[PDB]
Amino acid sequence: NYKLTRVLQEAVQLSSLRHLMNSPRNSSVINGLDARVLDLGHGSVGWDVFTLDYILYPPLSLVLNVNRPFGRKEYLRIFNFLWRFKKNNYFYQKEMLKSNDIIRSFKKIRGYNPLIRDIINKLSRISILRTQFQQFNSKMESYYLNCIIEENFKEMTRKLQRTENKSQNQFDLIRLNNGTIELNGILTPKAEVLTKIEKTLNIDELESVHNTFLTNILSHKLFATNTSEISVGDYSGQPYPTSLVLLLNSVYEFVKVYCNLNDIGYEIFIKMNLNDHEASNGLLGKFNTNLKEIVSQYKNFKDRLYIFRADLKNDGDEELFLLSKSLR
Amino acid sequence: YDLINVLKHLQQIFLGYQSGHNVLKFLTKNMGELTKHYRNDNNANYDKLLQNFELERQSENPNNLMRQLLMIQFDTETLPQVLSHYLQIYPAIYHLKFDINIPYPLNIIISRTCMIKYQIILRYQLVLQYHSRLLDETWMDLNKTPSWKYRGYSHTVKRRIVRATRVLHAKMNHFIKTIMEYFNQNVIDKEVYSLEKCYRNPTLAVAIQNELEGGLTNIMTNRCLSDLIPLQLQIFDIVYKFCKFIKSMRAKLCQLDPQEDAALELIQKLIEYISNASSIFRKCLINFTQELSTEKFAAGIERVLYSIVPP
Amino acid sequence: GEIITLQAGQCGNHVGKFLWSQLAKEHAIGTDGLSQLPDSSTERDDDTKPFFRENSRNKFTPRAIMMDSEPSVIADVENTFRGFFDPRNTWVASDGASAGNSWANGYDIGTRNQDDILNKIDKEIDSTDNFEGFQLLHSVAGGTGSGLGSNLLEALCDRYPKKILTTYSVFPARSSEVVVQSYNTILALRRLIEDSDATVVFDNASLLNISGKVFRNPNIDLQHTNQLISTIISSVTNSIRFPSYMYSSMSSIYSTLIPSPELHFLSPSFTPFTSAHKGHSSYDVMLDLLDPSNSLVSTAMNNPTYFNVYNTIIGNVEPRQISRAMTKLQQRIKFPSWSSSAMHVNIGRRSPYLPLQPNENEVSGMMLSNMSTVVNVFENACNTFDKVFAKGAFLNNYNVGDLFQSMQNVQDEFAESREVVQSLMEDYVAAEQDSYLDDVL
Amino acid sequence: MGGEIITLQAGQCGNHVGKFLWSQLAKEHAIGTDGLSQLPDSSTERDDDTKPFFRENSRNKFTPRAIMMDSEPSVIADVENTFRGFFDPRNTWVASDGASAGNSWANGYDIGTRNQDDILNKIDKEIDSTDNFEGFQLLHSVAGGTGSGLGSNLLEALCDRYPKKILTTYSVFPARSSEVVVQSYNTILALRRLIEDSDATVVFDNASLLNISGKVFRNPNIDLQHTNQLISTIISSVTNSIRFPSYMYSSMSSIYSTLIPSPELHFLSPSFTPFTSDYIHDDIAHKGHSSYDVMLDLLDPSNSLVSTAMNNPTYFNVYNTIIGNVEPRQISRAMTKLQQRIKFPSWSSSAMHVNIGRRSPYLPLQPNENEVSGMMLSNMSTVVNVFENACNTFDKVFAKGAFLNNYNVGDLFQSMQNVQDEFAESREVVQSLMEDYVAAEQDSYLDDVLVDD
Ligand SMILES: Nc1nc2c(ncn2[C@@H]2O[C@H](COP(=O)(O)OP(=O)(O)OP(=O)(O)O)[C@@H](O)[C@H]2O)c(=O)[nH]1
């Protein structure tokens, strides 16, 4: 964990956080960050074990909700979800850069290379398929990011900065599950009293604001994982986050077989550097088998994505309709 | 509380007073949804219509609390069914309604009886406006589709089939629109004007509510509406027959364009069908004419009489 | 629901200027397009959406595209309305000033630059979703105007078969240029029989006479007649620009006024109005609406055969005088025995954001009639055309493009226009007979 | 994944657009023409990041990480005198070789080959002044022969000198050429290396530049400097995703991931709304447009900076970055409308991508009509049309071999036969590139991996 905090300080120096590190008003906040390592058992990788927590102290701990040992670990599960997403995205980026560099090397030292044409075609198409996979991944990731950041900004503008530029909506309504809309409490007059500072929140009010914010985060349908209140996708029998985790596992297997294919291609490249098309026939056969495997994985994932689109369209939510249309 | 703005809002909502645009837009946006919810059962999902309604309410200005608190609901009974429930009359369409949860202290003046009256009047106006919208859509399909305006092949059909149904649609328009203008001017307009002129320097809020309920009663106790309801229940079925006939003829027009005598036999079937339909409409019109001539109370009545007098 | 205005020719540009000024004064928009209403109250009962596009600046740009072969009149209209119209909604064909008063040159200009106008109208329609139809402002007498109108009518009928298209066309007065002007008219009239879904007729001679009657100076300027047409167009659109309960669509008005697509030519009337006391009751208003000296077209008929009549009375009116005038009019107006004796009245609300017109509290009324008087002016025009055609072959000298390559096709097109207007007037005069609907009775 | 990028100014156009881009960046980051940040160095909190493009020696000074390379010392001296202390004099390369002996690509390639040691030393020294580096942004100015040759030389050096760095390029093509043969030959020779080594290339056809400068500016006469201002503003808007990093795209490699479907298709088509930081930018508040209208204009051919030639064009990677106060519902509506109005290849279900940027806290805030702008980049095959006519020129002049006595000097081959063979090879390369682009316009392209496995 000393190399860990060293890398943390270095990344802070590279990022704009160094500015906050320079300002003493922000050094206290930047020092309150304390990464944590969760005991997930022996044999796992750093991409699955490393967590990023923040340690708060009074008088701050009495307002902001942290991943307390007796809490619900909202930030913990959210960071784990975003961490798996970022891990998939980084793996896609690594495969992309490896493929791009190796194809650039081919183009540099191909000369004529007549027998490579078909292989180059296959590699281009497979990189396009990987690009489509990464596009779907980053698409779901960006949709999640958009919804999350929308929640954040609406919270700031309506909960953290409510007393500044209020909504002016003096009407407090309550929606019932049977479509009934009832006015909450007594109706106040339009500020007219016979006549002839800031409505700010205290400790517990701000803490309840934070907790309701976390709840609105976790109460999202796509975040409603393994709950009886969520509806499962039609013709699938599985909840939407369940099918999402299944698709994440599928695309991770796709990334791994793509890494294997890239290793095979690098070995074939080294062989071409060694001799001029006199060997690597077994490597060509293994390349063909990996191509067939990748095609099968792509077909299965496309069927799963079509089922997911059908579920989003038939769920009733217009936002799911829009997401399935955009994926379509 | 500015009671004048609230009463203006409720007149716009439940009475359509100076708000025909909003309700017309809502009807045009979801004609298909209404017909698919009225032809199906209660088990059919209407959540799409509810989502459209809440979206329209969100696009509504937040100051209009009467429209911001507007809530939609589906009933298990039809409008003539609840009319038979509340009034001694004899009647799966028009199961929709809208309601408002009047808060304190506004609930002590805006009671639930006036709310039920508003719901009844709103469902009635919705029926009327949907029928007028169906007539407008029929006229649009007739005057815009090229097959309807197209003629040829020694027609014998345009003058007999097209001209006849056009005259029939004209008759239905001269009936529905006439009675709508009559009810909205001699009843709706006069009651709106009285409601406007009464709150000028008021004395008792209970007196205001009593005047409001008395106007609602005069709207309900109108002999024209009571005489129309049973005849309306048949005129609307005649309108449904007319529009399904229009759809069938529109589907047949593209096929009749040029060789087979079976097509002529189908044309004979259609001409006897529409002649029988016109005769049935004429008989229902004569029945309603007898019913209104037996009524006693007459300007708009004389106008409707002139409309129903055969040329 | 949204409607787009089409100003063809200098006449169209003038009447569009006048109408948009009138509507900006009514809806409190002014000559700068900015909302003349305060931002404290958003409650409104009018509808500026179908005629004005409101941007983030809350400026109302008129939903109108100006098409003409004369850039000077359009530039002048822009100068008098600096900051009101959109420069992108301006179309002058980039061909310079006008040249040739024949329908051939105008239609050829329309065919050559049809792509730009199509792109403009597609961009205007894509700005919104709920569109209903277009409004065409042109004079049948003007050659370039009539050619552009016929070209755009063809484009909108073979491009938008679902959008009802209505037009405003003013027939020229008894003058000298008709010998060629009528030509354009009948050609346009040809398309008016084929693609025009609706048309409001006007006769320039009767318009000039009625203006000289209402105006003190008999030297009637064309801008005064343009003001009259702007007033009548704002009046017929009052039910659309100010809908309350009954009429909220021009489709309904053409339903209650146009019984069949073959008969879509209506004659207007409007009385009383200024362009300061009240002396015309609603009963008097309607009996004047019946009077020929209040119609915007030369009647030239003793007892015209009214088919379907519909009127809108503007002002605060009691239904008693309404019913009295309705009974008197039914006693006065004759209907065919095969058609209905339908008479409908719309109570048009006054705009509280409009400056008070002279003769305040004076109730007014507009009426649209379908009778055999429109066919009388049509017969006058067709007779003038037939005389000047069968008597002199001079039209073979002023043609452009496909019409200039051969004049025999021009003669054939003119003969076909004569034939179709003859069939139209025959259908009209047959509708006057009870035996018109004899095929069902 | 974010690294520093160094700007490469090659040719007179390259140096002019570099000057304009650095002035625009100084305007955005309040650095001015003196190299000293116009903001006091006491405010440490900065939402932007000048480090990827500005080296900070003193706290108030930010030296632009760029090298000035040209054969004409007059323009370099002019830019240095206008930007007193802004640029680094040690990063200004002229080689003292005098004026260019013609507009031949061979001349520039030779002057880059002979002085390759000095420029490589300067590049290595600049790399030593940084730690986290990602790649370069090269300005070709392929309209000039010496500039195109110098750009090709730098590309041929940096492809094998730094294979682990992503090399993006910016080629500016002219509308009309006084001697189309020479400029066509220079552009073909540069495009050969672009296909071989360049990782990303943005084309800039001067026809649309002249058209836009005549449309939005009041003056009918078009000056080259405010025309280069357009390209500089474009480059600043595209680099905004790193200078003002958003929450979706934070690295040039990530930006090119969604823009480069394959190393073969590495030529993009740009588009931008009416700018706001240009000279005559007062006629922008009268537009009264929304974000949906901004997207429409980005998809409109009138706002494309290259020759559109839109005859049912096939798109491959449509992306956009929107700067300003952007609304998500307008974005969703615009995406819905564009997916109904954009031709996509049926073999790929990938649609267009939308990105939203942030406005600088020190840039002049515009009225609510043009307060939000946007840039669009679409992978289209129509770019080869810009070369097609050029190849046509080749195809109609290479039968004789005019101007051959000018491409024989400087390069490694003085004979006519070797130069002819090299030109034929470059023509074959660009022909194969056009064939790849026209094959990508078909579904059989992706079906090639389906027919065999
Ligand atoms: N009432 C009225 N009619 C006009 C006005 N301007 C033109 N007109 C009509 O237009 C006819 C004359 O033709 P022009 O307006 O010159 O149309 P044109 O022949 O195509 O010539 P250009 O409009 O210049 O292209 C007259 O008979 C009028 O009926 C006007 O301002 N008021």
Ligand SMILES: Nc1nc2c(ncn2[C@@H]2O[C@H](COP(=O)(O)OP(=O)(O)OP(=O)(O)O)[C@@H](O)[C@H]2O)c(=O)[nH]1
């Ligand atoms: N639009 C535009 N194009 C330019 C500009 N400067 C140069 N060019 C292009 O460059 C071509 C002329 O070549 P130069 O850029 O001067 O290159 P060169 O001839 O080798 O001269 P040096 O670069 O000074 O060595 C012209 O055809 C232009 O298309 C400019 O400022 N604006």
